[PDB]
Scaffold this active site. Structure first.
Site, PDB file in Angstrom:
ATOM      1  N   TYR A  38      47.953  28.997  34.395  1.00  0.00           N
ATOM      2  CA  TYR A  38      47.598  30.169  33.601  1.00  0.00           C
ATOM      3  C   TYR A  38      48.182  29.984  32.202  1.00  0.00           C
ATOM      4  O   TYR A  38      49.240  29.382  32.051  1.00  0.00           O
ATOM      5  CB  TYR A  38      48.162  31.443  34.235  1.00  0.00           C
ATOM      6  CG  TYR A  38      47.576  31.786  35.586  1.00  0.00           C
ATOM      7  CD1 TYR A  38      46.314  32.374  35.695  1.00  0.00           C
ATOM      8  CD2 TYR A  38      48.280  31.528  36.758  1.00  0.00           C
ATOM      9  CE1 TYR A  38      45.770  32.693  36.941  1.00  0.00           C
ATOM     10  CE2 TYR A  38      47.750  31.841  38.002  1.00  0.00           C
ATOM     11  CZ  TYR A  38      46.498  32.420  38.089  1.00  0.00           C
ATOM     12  OH  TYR A  38      45.984  32.719  39.329  1.00  0.00           O
ATOM     13  N   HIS A  40      43.955  30.542  31.943  1.00  0.00           N
ATOM     14  CA  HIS A  40      42.808  29.664  32.016  1.00  0.00           C
ATOM     15  C   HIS A  40      41.534  30.466  31.891  1.00  0.00           C
ATOM     16  O   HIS A  40      41.555  31.694  31.950  1.00  0.00           O
ATOM     17  CB  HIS A  40      42.829  28.759  33.261  1.00  0.00           C
ATOM     18  CG  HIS A  40      42.800  29.488  34.561  1.00  0.00           C
ATOM     19  ND1 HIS A  40      43.779  29.328  35.521  1.00  0.00           N
ATOM     20  CD2 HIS A  40      41.896  30.351  35.092  1.00  0.00           C
ATOM     21  CE1 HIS A  40      43.478  30.055  36.582  1.00  0.00           C
ATOM     22  NE2 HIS A  40      42.341  30.686  36.345  1.00  0.00           N
ATOM     23  N   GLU A  58      42.144  34.498  31.590  1.00  0.00           N
ATOM     24  CA  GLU A  58      42.882  35.394  32.461  1.00  0.00           C
ATOM     25  C   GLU A  58      44.352  35.019  32.500  1.00  0.00           C
ATOM     26  O   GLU A  58      44.712  33.842  32.436  1.00  0.00           O
ATOM     27  CB  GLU A  58      42.289  35.435  33.869  1.00  0.00           C
ATOM     28  CG  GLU A  58      42.409  34.175  34.676  1.00  0.00           C
ATOM     29  CD  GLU A  58      41.961  34.394  36.113  1.00  0.00           C
ATOM     30  OE1 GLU A  58      42.777  34.873  36.928  1.00  0.00           O
ATOM     31  OE2 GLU A  58      40.785  34.119  36.413  1.00  0.00           O
ATOM     32  N   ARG A  77      45.314  40.945  36.735  1.00  0.00           N
ATOM     33  CA  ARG A  77      45.157  40.076  35.565  1.00  0.00           C
ATOM     34  C   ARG A  77      44.724  40.825  34.316  1.00  0.00           C
ATOM     35  O   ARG A  77      44.035  41.855  34.387  1.00  0.00           O
ATOM     36  CB  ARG A  77      44.063  39.022  35.805  1.00  0.00           C
ATOM     37  CG  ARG A  77      44.121  38.256  37.109  1.00  0.00           C
ATOM     38  CD  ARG A  77      45.170  37.169  37.094  1.00  0.00           C
ATOM     39  NE  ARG A  77      45.110  36.382  38.324  1.00  0.00           N
ATOM     40  CZ  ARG A  77      45.800  36.663  39.426  1.00  0.00           C
ATOM     41  NH1 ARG A  77      46.619  37.706  39.461  1.00  0.00           N
ATOM     42  NH2 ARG A  77      45.639  35.919  40.513  1.00  0.00           N
ATOM     43  N   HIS A  92      42.240  41.821  42.181  1.00  0.00           N
ATOM     44  CA  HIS A  92      41.672  41.312  43.427  1.00  0.00           C
ATOM     45  C   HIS A  92      41.719  42.436  44.468  1.00  0.00           C
ATOM     46  O   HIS A  92      41.020  42.391  45.488  1.00  0.00           O
ATOM     47  CB  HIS A  92      42.506  40.142  43.970  1.00  0.00           C
ATOM     48  CG  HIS A  92      42.213  38.822  43.322  1.00  0.00           C
ATOM     49  ND1 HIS A  92      40.938  38.311  43.211  1.00  0.00           N
ATOM     50  CD2 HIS A  92      43.037  37.893  42.785  1.00  0.00           C
ATOM     51  CE1 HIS A  92      40.990  37.125  42.637  1.00  0.00           C
ATOM     52  NE2 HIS A  92      42.254  36.848  42.369  1.00  0.00           N
ATOM     53  N   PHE A 100      36.828  40.038  41.849  1.00  0.00           N
ATOM     54  CA  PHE A 100      37.613  40.998  41.084  1.00  0.00           C
ATOM     55  C   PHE A 100      36.839  42.297  40.913  1.00  0.00           C
ATOM     56  O   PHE A 100      35.615  42.327  41.029  1.00  0.00           O
ATOM     57  CB  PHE A 100      37.896  40.477  39.661  1.00  0.00           C
ATOM     58  CG  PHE A 100      38.931  39.379  39.576  1.00  0.00           C
ATOM     59  CD1 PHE A 100      40.289  39.668  39.668  1.00  0.00           C
ATOM     60  CD2 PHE A 100      38.544  38.062  39.335  1.00  0.00           C
ATOM     61  CE1 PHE A 100      41.245  38.667  39.512  1.00  0.00           C
ATOM     62  CE2 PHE A 100      39.492  37.057  39.177  1.00  0.00           C
ATOM     63  CZ  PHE A 100      40.846  37.359  39.267  1.00  0.00           C
TER      64      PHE A 100
HETATM   65  N1  LIG Z   1      36.364  35.692  40.901  1.00  0.00           N
HETATM   66  C1  LIG Z   1      36.395  34.929  39.805  1.00  0.00           C
HETATM   67  N2  LIG Z   1      37.235  33.886  39.744  1.00  0.00           N
HETATM   68  C2  LIG Z   1      37.161  33.203  38.574  1.00  0.00           C
HETATM   69  C3  LIG Z   1      36.348  33.470  37.503  1.00  0.00           C
HETATM   70  N3  LIG Z   1      36.558  32.553  36.482  1.00  0.00           N
HETATM   71  C4  LIG Z   1      37.479  31.766  36.966  1.00  0.00           C
HETATM   72  N4  LIG Z   1      37.904  32.089  38.235  1.00  0.00           N
HETATM   73  C5  LIG Z   1      38.928  31.377  39.059  1.00  0.00           C
HETATM   74  O1  LIG Z   1      38.528  31.175  40.438  1.00  0.00           O
HETATM   75  C6  LIG Z   1      39.617  31.584  41.318  1.00  0.00           C
HETATM   76  C7  LIG Z   1      39.258  32.951  41.975  1.00  0.00           C
HETATM   77  O2  LIG Z   1      40.366  33.677  42.549  1.00  0.00           O
HETATM   78  C8  LIG Z   1      40.846  31.707  40.411  1.00  0.00           C
HETATM   79  O3  LIG Z   1      41.430  30.412  40.119  1.00  0.00           O
HETATM   80  P1  LIG Z   1      42.967  30.030  40.493  1.00  0.00           P
HETATM   81  O4  LIG Z   1      42.979  30.141  41.981  1.00  0.00           O
HETATM   82  O5  LIG Z   1      43.087  28.653  39.961  1.00  0.00           O
HETATM   83  O6  LIG Z   1      43.796  31.029  39.773  1.00  0.00           O
HETATM   84  C9  LIG Z   1      40.161  32.237  39.170  1.00  0.00           C
HETATM   85  O7  LIG Z   1      41.008  32.044  38.061  1.00  0.00           O
HETATM   86  C10 LIG Z   1      35.455  34.579  37.571  1.00  0.00           C
HETATM   87  O8  LIG Z   1      34.673  34.927  36.697  1.00  0.00           O
HETATM   88  N5  LIG Z   1      35.542  35.267  38.775  1.00  0.00           N
END
Ligand SMILES: Nc1nc2c(ncn2[C@@H]2O[C@H](CO)[C@@H](OP(=O)(O)O)[C@H]2O)c(=O)[nH]1
Ligand SMILES: [Ca+2]
Length: 104
Positions: A38, A40, A58, A77, A92, A100
Protein backbone atom coordinates in the site's frame (compact mmCIF):
# COMPACT_ATOMS: atom_id res chain seq x y z
CA UNK A 1 -21.52 11.99 14.91
CA UNK A 2 -19.35 10.14 12.39
CA UNK A 3 -18.37 11.86 9.16
CA UNK A 4 -17.86 8.37 7.74
CA UNK A 5 -19.28 5.12 9.13
CA UNK A 6 -17.68 1.87 7.92
CA UNK A 7 -19.68 -0.91 9.54
CA UNK A 8 -19.06 -0.28 13.25
CA UNK A 9 -16.03 1.97 12.68
CA UNK A 10 -16.51 5.70 13.15
CA UNK A 11 -14.25 8.20 11.37
CA UNK A 12 -14.03 11.97 11.41
CA UNK A 13 -12.78 14.16 8.56
CA UNK A 14 -9.52 14.66 10.46
CA UNK A 15 -9.05 10.87 10.69
CA UNK A 16 -9.44 10.64 6.91
CA UNK A 17 -7.16 13.60 6.12
CA UNK A 18 -4.41 12.19 8.34
CA UNK A 19 -4.59 8.75 6.69
CA UNK A 20 -4.77 10.27 3.20
CA UNK A 21 -1.73 12.50 3.78
CA UNK A 22 0.36 9.46 4.75
CA UNK A 23 -0.72 7.37 1.77
CA UNK A 24 -0.19 10.23 -0.67
CA UNK A 25 3.29 10.93 0.68
CA UNK A 26 4.26 7.30 0.09
CA UNK A 27 2.73 7.46 -3.40
CA UNK A 28 4.79 10.56 -4.26
CA UNK A 29 8.01 8.93 -3.08
CA UNK A 30 7.28 5.71 -4.95
CA UNK A 31 7.43 3.58 -1.81
CA UNK A 32 5.06 1.03 -0.26
CA UNK A 33 4.35 -0.57 3.13
CA UNK A 34 2.87 -3.93 4.08
CA UNK A 35 2.85 -7.30 2.33
CA UNK A 36 0.04 -6.12 0.05
CA UNK A 37 2.04 -3.06 -0.96
CA UNK A 38 0.00 0.00 0.00
CA UNK A 39 -0.78 2.40 -1.41
CA UNK A 40 -1.65 0.81 -4.73
CA UNK A 41 -3.97 1.28 -7.66
CA UNK A 42 -7.70 0.96 -7.01
CA UNK A 43 -9.42 -0.12 -10.22
CA UNK A 44 -12.98 0.75 -9.13
CA UNK A 45 -14.38 -2.59 -10.37
CA UNK A 46 -17.34 -1.79 -8.10
CA UNK A 47 -18.13 1.20 -10.30
CA UNK A 48 -18.54 3.85 -7.60
CA UNK A 49 -19.47 7.25 -8.98
CA UNK A 50 -16.57 9.32 -7.64
CA UNK A 51 -16.60 13.09 -8.17
CA UNK A 52 -12.86 13.28 -8.91
CA UNK A 53 -10.75 11.92 -11.79
CA UNK A 54 -8.82 8.65 -11.88
CA UNK A 55 -6.32 7.05 -11.39
CA UNK A 56 -7.31 6.08 -7.85
CA UNK A 57 -5.15 4.68 -5.05
CA UNK A 58 -6.25 2.83 -1.94
CA UNK A 59 -4.70 3.22 1.50
CA UNK A 60 -5.85 1.62 4.78
CA UNK A 61 -7.51 3.74 7.45
CA UNK A 62 -7.37 2.17 10.92
CA UNK A 63 -10.05 2.28 13.63
CA UNK A 64 -7.21 2.50 16.16
CA UNK A 65 -6.47 6.03 15.00
CA UNK A 66 -2.93 4.99 14.03
CA UNK A 67 -1.50 5.49 10.55
CA UNK A 68 -0.99 2.20 8.67
CA UNK A 69 2.57 0.89 8.81
CA UNK A 70 2.26 -2.80 7.99
CA UNK A 71 0.45 -5.93 9.09
CA UNK A 72 -3.31 -6.38 8.85
CA UNK A 73 -4.88 -3.38 7.03
CA UNK A 74 -8.33 -4.08 8.44
CA UNK A 75 -11.45 -3.68 6.31
CA UNK A 76 -11.42 0.09 5.68
CA UNK A 77 -9.70 2.20 3.01
CA UNK A 78 -9.38 5.81 1.90
CA UNK A 79 -9.28 6.27 -1.89
CA UNK A 80 -7.43 9.32 -3.25
CA UNK A 81 -6.26 10.39 -6.71
CA UNK A 82 -3.15 11.78 -8.41
CA UNK A 83 -3.96 15.30 -7.18
CA UNK A 84 -4.41 14.18 -3.57
CA UNK A 85 -8.18 14.65 -3.86
CA UNK A 86 -10.33 12.41 -1.66
CA UNK A 87 -12.46 10.12 -3.84
CA UNK A 88 -14.15 8.42 -0.91
CA UNK A 89 -13.97 6.02 2.03
CA UNK A 90 -14.81 2.37 1.37
CA UNK A 91 -14.97 -0.89 3.29
CA UNK A 92 -15.01 -4.68 2.92
CA UNK A 93 -17.51 -4.74 5.82
CA UNK A 94 -20.98 -5.70 4.62
CA UNK A 95 -19.70 -6.66 1.17
CA UNK A 96 -19.30 -10.16 -0.31
CA UNK A 97 -15.85 -11.72 -0.53
CA UNK A 98 -13.26 -9.05 -1.31
CA UNK A 99 -15.68 -6.53 -2.78
CA UNK A 100 -16.18 -3.04 -1.32
CA UNK A 101 -19.16 -0.87 -0.39
CA UNK A 102 -19.02 2.82 0.47
CA UNK A 103 -18.89 3.98 4.06
CA UNK A 104 -21.97 6.06 4.88
N1 LIG B 1 -12.62 -5.23 -4.83
C1 LIG B 1 -11.66 -4.55 -5.47
N2 LIG B 1 -10.38 -4.87 -5.25
C2 LIG B 1 -9.51 -4.11 -5.97
C3 LIG B 1 -9.81 -3.10 -6.84
N3 LIG B 1 -8.66 -2.54 -7.38
C4 LIG B 1 -7.70 -3.23 -6.82
N4 LIG B 1 -8.13 -4.21 -5.94
C5 LIG B 1 -7.29 -5.16 -5.16
O1 LIG B 1 -7.78 -6.53 -5.19
C6 LIG B 1 -7.80 -7.05 -3.83
C7 LIG B 1 -9.27 -7.10 -3.32
O2 LIG B 1 -9.43 -7.22 -1.89
C8 LIG B 1 -6.95 -6.08 -3.00
O3 LIG B 1 -5.53 -6.31 -3.18
P1 LIG B 1 -4.53 -6.68 -1.95
O4 LIG B 1 -5.09 -7.97 -1.46
O5 LIG B 1 -3.22 -6.77 -2.63
O6 LIG B 1 -4.65 -5.54 -1.01
C9 LIG B 1 -7.34 -4.79 -3.70
O7 LIG B 1 -6.39 -3.80 -3.40
C10 LIG B 1 -11.18 -2.77 -7.07
O8 LIG B 1 -11.59 -1.90 -7.83
N5 LIG B 1 -12.05 -3.56 -6.34
CA1 LIG C 1 -10.89 9.03 15.26
Amino acid sequence: ACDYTCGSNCYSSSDVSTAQAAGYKLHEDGETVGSNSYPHKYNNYEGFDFSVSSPYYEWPILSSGDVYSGGSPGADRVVFNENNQLAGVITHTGASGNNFVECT
